[PDB]
Structure formats: structure tokens, C-alpha cells
Amino acid sequence: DVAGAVIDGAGLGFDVLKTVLEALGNVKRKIAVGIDNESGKTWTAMNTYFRSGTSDIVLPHKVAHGKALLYNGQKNRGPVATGVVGVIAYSMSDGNTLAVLFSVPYDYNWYSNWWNVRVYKGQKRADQRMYEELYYHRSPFRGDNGWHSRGLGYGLKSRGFMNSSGHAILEIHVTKA
Ligand SMILES: CCCCCC(=O)OC[C@H](COP(=O)(O)OCC[N+](C)(C)C)OC(=O)CCCCC
Ligand SMILES: CCCCCC(=O)OC[C@H](COP(=O)(O)OCC[N+](C)(C)C)OC(=O)CCCCC
Ligand SMILES: CCCCCC(=O)OC[C@H](COP(=O)(O)OCC[N+](C)(C)C)OC(=O)CCCCC
Ligand SMILES: CCCCCC(=O)OC[C@H](COP(=O)(O)OCC[N+](C)(C)C)OC(=O)CCCCC
Ligand SMILES: CCCCCC(=O)OC[C@H](COP(=O)(O)OCC[N+](C)(C)C)OC(=O)CCCCC
Ligand SMILES: C[N+](C)(C)CCOP(=O)(O)O
Ligand SMILES: C[N+](C)(C)CCOP(=O)(O)O
């Protein structure tokens, strides 16, 4: 149950993500991400685009149906007042891209936690424009300590949870609609 591994999908829960979050170190802003693939498709990691922050974890490369991936990120390790903000992109085996936004800001006087999950047509690496789409234009969810669900199209739906603090957990399930 470490960042960079896959686990059985039915084992994903808050306690796994707490474990990942604590293993990372006590840095001011950090995130543990788990995504359960119950999509019927095999996922292959492309990349993570960091608008803010970094990770030392390799995205789990192959995520079969029935598996969840574990991942983490953290703020820049230097003295800069920035958070951990980015997009994960996986290529799904029927030809499209699963994109996951996380935003864990440095300053909660001006910003809040957000996430999003969307399917893009074709095979699309995460980048600044994708980040701007998911953050500004494609109706992200609040990291509000509540669950949110939405249809993705493509025969898929998502349900996920993000907490509100700078030590963030993000749990997402992708299932067949
Ligand atoms: C584009 C490089 C120039 C520096 C701006 C930048 O990267 O954002 C830095 C900072 C860090 O943002 P961060 O906490 O990492 O992420 C939350 C903000 N978003 C999600 C928009 C990036 O956010 C700000 O713009 C500070 C200005 C405060 C105006 C109220
Ligand atoms: C385009 C930059 C200025 C307006 C952007 C914006 O939507 O501000 C978000 C602000 C709230 O930003 P938020 O992260 O909730 O709070 C900033 C933190 N405070 C409230 C302490 C300033 O408005 C709302 O209350 C509802 C918006 C939610 C969906 C668009
Ligand atoms: C009513 C369903 C919207 C989501 C499911 C879907 O059919 O997604 C297809 C596509 C997946 O996104 P993408 O691959 O980026 O294609 C839409 C953008 N264009 C038309 C430029 C290629 O999104 C759309 O065409 C409309 C939603 C995008 C507007 C926010
Ligand atoms: C008087 C300039 C105020 C700048 C607004 C700000 O605080 O940051 C918003 C933006 C948020 O970054 P991002 O979410 O990446 O969106 C960048 C591109 N836009 C704004 C078009 C979506 O960061 C910037 O690129 C402005 C940097 C000006 C620094 C002198
Ligand atoms: C006076 C109301 C507008 C400014 C305050 C606000 O709405 O919170 C906006 C924003 C929080 O914006 P953002 O994270 O872009 O919006 C959250 C909603 N989403 C995630 C959908 C974009 O923080 C800022 O950059 C303030 C800059 C002051 C210039 C007057
Ligand atoms: C951009 N960087 C990651 C190389 C340096 C720090 O940038 P930021 O964290 O101040 O945006
Ligand atoms: C508030 N904002 C200017 C940073 C977001 C709007 O930018 P844009 O994505 O419409 O170019």
C-alpha cells in the first residue's frame, strides 16, 4: 500500500490514502491520490502535469480493471509559497484519456481545494491547457469532505471524495454507467 503501486480496487479507502499521505513526510502541502479502475478497460500512465508542486512517484504504469492506483504529490521542496496543483492523464484501452485534476493551494485565504475527472477524446497528455480546462471551464468539484459523482460519457461514471485541508486525500472510483 504505497504510492506507485496498484492494489485490489475494493481495498481503496480513506485509511490506505491516510497511510500514503503520512508516508510522504510532514510537508506543508501534499496530496495522496487513489483511483479505482472498475471501467472495464486497462489504463496506461502517460504523465502528470504540475501547475504547482512535484512528485517523486512514478505513476503506476498499468492499471487493470479491478485495480486501484496509488499516487502522491507535494509542494515544491523549497521556500516558495505554492501548493500542489496538477493533472494526471491515463490512456484507456478503448482509445480515450482519463484526466484527473487536483488543486491543493498554498493560501486558503484566496483559494480552496478542487478536483475533477473527465474523459478526453483520443490520447491526450496532461498540460497547462488541460489544467485550465479542468480547473476553470469543466465544473470541478470542491474538496469539501463530501462525495460527488458524475457521468463521464463514454459509458463511464465517476464518484470521488476530496477533503478540505492542505494535507489532502483524493479517492476516485471509475465505473461503468
Ligand atoms: C505563473 C508563474 C507566476 C507566479 C504565479 C503562480 O504560479 O501562482 C503562484 C501562486 C501559487 O498558487 P498555488 O497555491 O500553487 O495554487 C492555487 C492557485 N491556482 C490553482 C490558481 C494555481 O498563486 C498565485 O497566483 C499567488 C497570487 C495570489 C493572488 C491572490
Ligand atoms: C476569476 C477570478 C475571480 C472569480 C473566481 C471565482 O469563482 O471565485 C471563486 C469564489 C469562491 O472561490 P473559493 O475557492 O470558494 O474561495 C476563495 C476563498 N475565499 C472565499 C476565502 C476568498 O466564488 C464563489 O463563491 C463561487 C465560485 C465557485 C464555482 C465557480
Ligand atoms: C454531454 C457529454 C459531455 C461529456 C462526455 C463526452 O461526450 O465528452 C466528449 C468530449 C470529451 O472532451 P474533448 O475530447 O476535449 O472534446 C471536446 C473539445 N473539442 C470539441 C474541442 C474536441 O467533450 C465534449 O465534446 C463536450 C464536453 C467538452 C466541453 C467542456
Ligand atoms: C495584477 C496581476 C494579477 C495576476 C492574477 C493572479 O494573482 O494569478 C492568476 C493566474 C493563475 O494562474 P493559472 O491558473 O495558471 O491561469 C493562467 C492563465 N489564465 C489566467 C488565462 C487561465 O496567475 C497568473 O498567471 C497571473 C500572474 C501575474 C503575475 C504578475
Ligand atoms: C471580489 C470577488 C472576486 C475575487 C475574490 C474571489 O472571488 O475569490 C477568487 C479567487 C479564487 O479563485 P479561483 O480559484 O480561480 O475560483 C474557484 C472556482 N473555480 C475552481 C471553478 C475556478 O482568488 C483570487 O485570485 C483573488 C484575486 C483578487 C482580484 C480581484
Ligand atoms: C517553477 N519551478 C517549479 C521550477 C520553481 C518554483 O515555481 P513555483 O512553485 O514558485 O511556481
Ligand atoms: C480568472 N482567470 C483569468 C485566471 C481564469 C480565466 O481564464 P481563461 O481560462 O478564460 O483564459
Numbering used by the authors: 3 to 179
Q: Which statements did the authors publish about this structure?
A:
Fragaceatoxin C (FraC)11 is a potent haemolysin of the family of actinoporins, defined as a group of ~20 kDa protein toxins produced by sea anemones. Actinoporins are classified as α-helical PFT (α-PFT) because the transmembrane pore is predicted to form an α-helical barrel. The lytic activity of actinoporins on biological membranes is enhanced by the lipid sphingomyelin (SM) and by lipid-phase coexistence. Here we reveal structures of FraC corresponding to four different stages of its activation route, namely the water-soluble form, the lipid-bound form, an assembly intermediate and the transmembrane pore.
To examine the lipid-bound conformation, we determined three independent crystal structures of FraC in complex with the water-soluble lipid 1,2-dihexanoyl-sn-glycero-3-phosphocholine (DHPC) at resolutions ranging from 1.6 to 2.3 Å. Remarkably, up to four lipid molecules are bound to a single protein chain. The molecules of DHPC bound to each molecule of FraC lie on a common plane, resembling the surface of a membrane. Although multiple molecules of DHPC bind to FraC, the toxin remains monomeric and its overall structure is virtually unchanged with respect to that of the water-soluble form (rmsd=0.37±0.10 Å). The examination of the structure in three different crystal forms reveals two well-conserved lipid-binding pockets, suggesting they are the primary sites during the initial adhesion of FraC to membranes. These two pockets overlap with those of lipids L2 and L3 seen in the structure of the transmembrane pore, and establish comparable non-covalent interactions with the lipids. In contrast, no evidence of the L1 lipid is found because the protein remains monomeric and, therefore, lacks a second protein chain contributing half of the binding site of L1. FraC–lipid interactions occur mainly at the headgroup region of the lipids. Because the headgroups of SM and DHPC are identical, that is, phosphorylcholine (POC), the crystal structures explain the targeting of actinoporins towards synthetic membranes containing these two types of lipids.
